[PDB]
Design a protein around this ligand. Structure first.
Ligand SMILES: Cc1cc2nc3c(=O)[nH]c(=O)nc-3n(C[C@H](O)[C@H](O)[C@H](O)COP(=O)(O)OP(=O)(O)OC[C@H]3O[C@@H](n4cnc5c(N)ncnc54)[C@H](O)[C@@H]3O)c2cc1C
Ligand SMILES: *[C@@H]1O[C@H](CO)[C@@H](O)[C@H](O)[C@H]1NC(C)=O
Ligand SMILES: *[C@@H]1O[C@H](CO)[C@@H](O)[C@H](O)[C@H]1NC(C)=O
Ligand SMILES: *[C@@H]1O[C@H](CO)[C@@H](O)[C@H](O)[C@H]1NC(C)=O
Ligand SMILES: *[C@@H]1O[C@H](CO)[C@@H](O)[C@H](O)[C@H]1NC(C)=O
Ligand SMILES: *[C@@H]1O[C@H](CO)[C@@H](O)[C@H](O)[C@H]1NC(C)=O
Ligand SMILES: *[C@@H]1O[C@H](CO)[C@@H](O)[C@H](O)[C@H]1NC(C)=O
Ligand SMILES: *[C@@H]1O[C@H](CO)[C@@H](O)[C@H](O)[C@H]1NC(C)=O
Ligand SMILES: O=Cc1ccccc1
Length: 517
């Protein structure tokens, strides 16, 4: 079941032969499919559709060769440390809760900037949704992604320490190496290969048909165009010089929005698809009223402590996961820095580490708390929308963080972690901490959870199946319009969702092709 995994190899940019600047007006015209957003779901979706049909993929960012630190594990922090000048692969934002965050702006989407952790969805997820999944095809599609960009990670000293700690702390059983989201401790896959080269969703464009697939970069899609039976017919997009362009679908073809949790509700709202009284209050003509566009937007909380060992530890990428139903835990080890990677810590005024440190982390599942995306500009898609997640508004989320923080306490008490204490005392105050240490009444853990929350970066929702979309990802009430990306589900598929959303892009592409045949 692992014969098919990818090998160590250079990042494959062969697909650049059909990538063009959106300034090229000859890209304007009619296609069978237009995919908006060249990201985690959008790239394998476009590649899949191009097996049989003419596809235009539109991405607002540029190509990853322009930002070489996106292409190595060693460059992960660099892209977050880099200032956001409107063109960089990392776009910075702050939720209305006050928590710093980022999204991608690059061909390949968030797989070009993320921490590389690869996992398949919790196998119970499919029946939880109630969608009639073709489960055999789901698994074939995971293998199609994994053959291109997923490896079995080599050993990393810190990842092995934390795995021994998770097991000693009772996060059982030992699952060895496995891609599956199951209770226990395991080594999972990575989209960094064993030479440190990042592999990503853009490489899945290499599986497209180069005679049928066209990609426009620095293409800012501003509006979905509709028929004068309401149908999507095309898009308006602007190029890096600011000039406008139009592209259309033809016949039985379709527009699919794959612009992410933030970008997809924004574009739907700008296009008149959304809550009637809200759009009317902005004087946006309503094309399709739906009270849920931009509603039910979720961000799984990240809580953490940081330890500063008295001897240097080796930096690592996350590969070893400790999974329970009520918390998902990992640890990153890092070099010190004097410029913070934006959103690693929730505020810019966080203390800076002067030596190597271990960031020890727990994730709240769900979450049950949710907020919304609303427009900041009623016209300009380059102006980021407002986004609020309402962290810990739901008491179940807070209770689950308390459980995870207690388990992090257990982890710090293991023999495995003992050699990284600065003082050989009995308690966990023998560690040196960067930032706030763990407090053991439930009230002190609740305060810690609330005060020190950060984004796990795994936000989702805003165009949910069952609210905005049907079980085939069609926008209800509109022909020839679908949404495929992380805006579509209200809960996580697992601890690390890129593997699910990579699969989903191709999977829905195959469903489109089958429906059409
Ligand atoms: C820093 C970070 C680390 C992460 N680490 C991991 C991890 O290790 N493992 C894991 O499993 N998950 C991880 N995640 C989460 C996971 O990567 C994302 O949830 C997932 O990639 C989202 O996929 P998507 O297709 O919804 O969005 P994206 O991949 O972001 O794709 C959306 C694309 O649409 C483009 N776009 C947006 N609006 C427009 C527009 N109007 N016109 C044109 N293009 C547009 C964007 O530029 C982008 O390329 C991480 C997330 C972040 C931010
Ligand atoms: C990796 O290479 C080996 C032999 O060199 C082979 O088993 C396998 O086909 C390769 N994997 C991929 C994904 O190409
Ligand atoms: C597209 O062309 C413009 C000039 O017309 C240039 O400024 C920009 O860098 C180009 N973008 C890409 C992605 O090549
Ligand atoms: C799909 O693969 C998973 C492992 O990821 C396995 O547990 C499951 O049985 C498979 N399902 C089908 C329908 O083959
Ligand atoms: C919408 O337009 C009407 C005029 O038709 C105006 O009275 C109202 O203030 C406008 N509202 C906004 C938010 O532009
Ligand atoms: C997997 O998903 C099911 C269904 O939502 C849930 O009950 C279970 O706790 C999950 N398991 C893990 C290990 O997250
Ligand atoms: C736009 O965003 C800024 C920055 O968060 C905020 O202060 C402002 O209130 C927002 N404006 C609108 C109209 O949403
Ligand atoms: C928390 O979420 C659960 C599940 O959606 C819900 O039943 C409950 O009412 C929520 N609590 C509050 C205070 O909204
Ligand atoms: O789970 C992935 C991760 C990576 C860096 C920091 C926190 C979490």
């Amino acid at each position: 079941h692992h014969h098919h995994l990818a090998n160590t190899s250079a990042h494959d940019f062969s697909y650049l032969k059909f990538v063009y600047n959106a300034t090229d007006t000859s890209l304007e015209g009619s296609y069978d499919y237009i995919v908006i957003g060249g990201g985690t779901s959008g790239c394998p979706l476009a590649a899949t559709l191009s097996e049989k049909y003419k596809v235009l993929l539109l991405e607002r960012g540029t190509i990853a060769t322009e930002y070489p630190n996106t292409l190595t594990a060693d460059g992960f922090a660099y892209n977050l440390q880099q200032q956001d000048d409107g063109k960089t692969p990392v776009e910075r934002f702050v939720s209305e809760d006050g928590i710093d965050n980022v999204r991608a702006r690059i061909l390949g989407g968030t797989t070009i900037i993320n921490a590389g952790v690869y996992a398949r969805a919790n196998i119970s997820f499919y029946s939880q949704t109630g969608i009639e999944w073709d489960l055999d095809l789901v698994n074939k599609t995971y293998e199609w992604v994994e053959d291109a960009i997923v490896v079995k990670p080599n050993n990393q000293s810190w990842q092995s320490v934390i795995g021994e700690g998770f097991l000693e702390a009772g996060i059982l059983p030992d699952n060895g190496f496995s891609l599956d989201h199951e209770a226990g401790t395991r080594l999972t896959g990575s989209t960094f290969d064993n030479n440190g080269t990042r592999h990503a969703a853009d490489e899945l464009l290499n599986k497209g048909d180069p005679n049928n697939l066209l990609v426009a970069v620095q293409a800012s899609v501003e509006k979905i165009l509709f028929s004068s039976n309401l149908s999507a017919i095309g898009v308006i997009y602007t190029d890096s010089d600011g000039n406008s362009h139009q592209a259309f679908v033809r016949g039985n073809g379709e527009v699919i929005v794959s612009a992410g949790t933030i970008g997809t509700p924004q574009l739907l709202l700008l296009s008149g698809v959304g809550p009637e009284s809200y759009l009317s209050s902005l004087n946006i003509t309503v094309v399709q009223p739906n009270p849920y566009v931009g509603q039910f937007v979720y961000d799984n909380p990240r809580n953490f402590i940081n330890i500063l060992p008295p001897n240097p530890i080796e930096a690592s990428v996350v590969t070893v996961l400790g999974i329970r139903s009520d918390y998902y835990q990992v640890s990153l080890s890092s070099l010190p820095f004097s410029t913070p990677p934006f959103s690693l810590f929730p505020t810019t005024s966080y203390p800076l580490p002067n030596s190597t440190f271990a960031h020890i982390v727990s994730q709240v599942p769900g979450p049950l708390s949710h907020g919304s995306v609303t427009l900041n500009s009623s016209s300009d898609v380059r102006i980021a929308p407002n986004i609020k997640f309402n962290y810990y508004s739901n008491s179940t989320d807070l209770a689950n963080c308390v459980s995870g923080m207690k388990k992090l306490g257990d982890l710090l008490r293991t023999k495995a972690l003992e050699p990284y204490k600065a003082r050989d005392v009995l308690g966990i105050d023998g560690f040196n901490y960067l930032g706030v240490p763990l407090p053991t009444d439930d009230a002190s853990f609740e305060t810690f959870c609330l005060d020190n929350v950060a984004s796990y970066w795994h936000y989702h929702g805003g165009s949910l199946v069952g609210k905005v979309l049907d079980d085939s990802f069609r926008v209800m009430g509109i022909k020839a319009l679908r949404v495929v990306d992380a805006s579509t589900f209200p809960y996580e598929p697992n601890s690390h969702p890129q593997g699910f959303y990579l699969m989903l892009g191709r999977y829905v592409g195959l469903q489109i092709l089958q429906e059409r045949s």
